[PDB]
Amino acid sequence: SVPSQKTYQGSYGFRLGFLHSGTAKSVTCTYSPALNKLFCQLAKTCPVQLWVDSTPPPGTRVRAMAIYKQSQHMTEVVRRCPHHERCSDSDGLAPPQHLIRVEGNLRAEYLDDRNTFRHSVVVPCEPPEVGSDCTTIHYNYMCYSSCMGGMNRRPILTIITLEDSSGNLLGRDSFEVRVCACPGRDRRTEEENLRK
Ligand SMILES: CCN(CC)c1nc2c(C(=O)O)c(O)c(I)c(-n3cccc3)c2s1
Ligand SMILES: [Zn+2]
Numbered sequence: 799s800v801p802s803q804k805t806y807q808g809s810y811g812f813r814l815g816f817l818h819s820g821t822a823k824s825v826t827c828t829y830s831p832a833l834n835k836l837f838c839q840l841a842k843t844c845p846v847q848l849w850v851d852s853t854p855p856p857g858t859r860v861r862a863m864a865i866y867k868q869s870q871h872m873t874e875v876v877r878r879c880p881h882h883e884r885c886s887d888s889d890g891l892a893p894p895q896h897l898i899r900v901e902g903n904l905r906a907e908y909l910d911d912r913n914t915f916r917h918s919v920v921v922p923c924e925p926p927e928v929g930s931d932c933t934t935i936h937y938n939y940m941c942y943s944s945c946m947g948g949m950n951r952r953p954i955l956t957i958i959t960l961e962d963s964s965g966n967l968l969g970r971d972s973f974e975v976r977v978c979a980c981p982g983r984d985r986r987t988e989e990e991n992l993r994k
Pocket of ligand 2: 878879880881882883940941942945946948
């Protein structure tokens with residue numbers, strides 16, 4: 799079993815957005831449109847914007863889940879490595895095995911799927927504040943892409959789904975993620991590799 803990664807705007811015109819953070823050595827999170835890939839440091843804030851063309855119903859939620867990008871690994875659950883799942887860095891809500899956390903939202907819920915064993919984190923879909931045109935969720939990634947016994951250098955995607963109150967699909971978007979010590983340098987390197 800493998801979750802779908804097909805982009806689907808749905809009835810509400812759902813899609814993600816990312817800030818323009820640049821590639822300076824000091825950057826902690828930076829998004830490459832050319833690669834559709836987020837580069838971020840371990841456990842640092844990753845702002846992900848949610849955009850819609852029309853307001854979804856009360857009770858709509860937004861779920862995040864990681865899968866391996868390579869087909870030969872897609873059936874393996876993405877989880878924290880044997881070190882990080884034991885490192886006592888709980889925020890009081892996220893299970894220590896979960897790679898993806900939501901920062902600063904007490905209504906976040908963490909799911910261990912009873913059938914697929916996959917992890918996800920889901921929040922209620924809140925309207926933009928007055929003066930804003932979108933809503934932002936702040937994610938944290940709690941292992942490096944290189945962590946041995948976990949991701950082990952394998953690339954991952956994050957799939958963001960807009961869901962109704964029953965969990966039915968309303969919209970879907972996705973992006974690759976690399977969790978690394980120097981996201982600005984790695985984004986520059988990979989964009990150069992793509993250009994060459
Ligand atoms: C169901 C609650 N609700 C009505 C009050 C919402 N309205 C919006 C609006 C809007 O009315 O403009 C929006 O632009 C975005 I982006 C939203 N959002 C939040 C996470 C995903 C989408 C929500 S949630
Ligand atoms: Zn780790």
